[PDB]
Amino acid sequence: MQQQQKEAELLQKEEANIRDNQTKIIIAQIQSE
Amino acid sequence: MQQQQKEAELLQKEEANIRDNQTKIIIAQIQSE
């Protein structure tokens, strides 16, 4: 359960980080308007 | 209970982080005005 504990928070950080990268490109396209 | 303790603060950080990303796009659209 401690591994099912930690594997959740490990994938939490990578998908949080893509979501910051997804917004950093879409802020650029509205600045390209 | 300690896992119900920690799973609350783990989802707390991811939804806090989307809410920062939600505001970083909406500040850009009013700057696109």
What is the DSSP secondary-structure string of chain A?
A: -HHHHHHHHHHHHHHHHHHHHHHHHHHHHHHT-
Cβ(A15)–Cβ(B18) under 8 Å?
Answer: no
Cβ(A31)–Cβ(B28) under 8 Å?
Answer: yes
- Residue A1 token pair: 């359960």
- Residue whose C-alpha is closest to residue A7's, from B15, B13, B7: B7
CA-angle at B1, arms to A9 and A8, nearest 5°: 15
Cβ(B18)–Cβ(A20) under 8 Å?
Answer: no
Q: For A19, which of B3, B13, B21 is closest by C-beta distance? A: B21
A vs B, Cβ pairs < 8 A, gives 33
- Distance separating alpha carbons of residues B33 and B17, to the nearest angstrom: 25
Q: Which residue of B has its CA nearest to A13?
A: B14
Interface membership of A5 toward B (CB under 8 Å): yes
- Residue B27 token pair: 């500040």
Resolution (Å) of this entry: 3.1
- Distance separating alpha carbons of residues A6 and B10, to the nearest angstrom: 10
CA-angle at B27, arms to B29 and A28, nearest 5°: 60
Q: For B24, which of A1, A5, A27 is closest by C-beta distance? A: A27
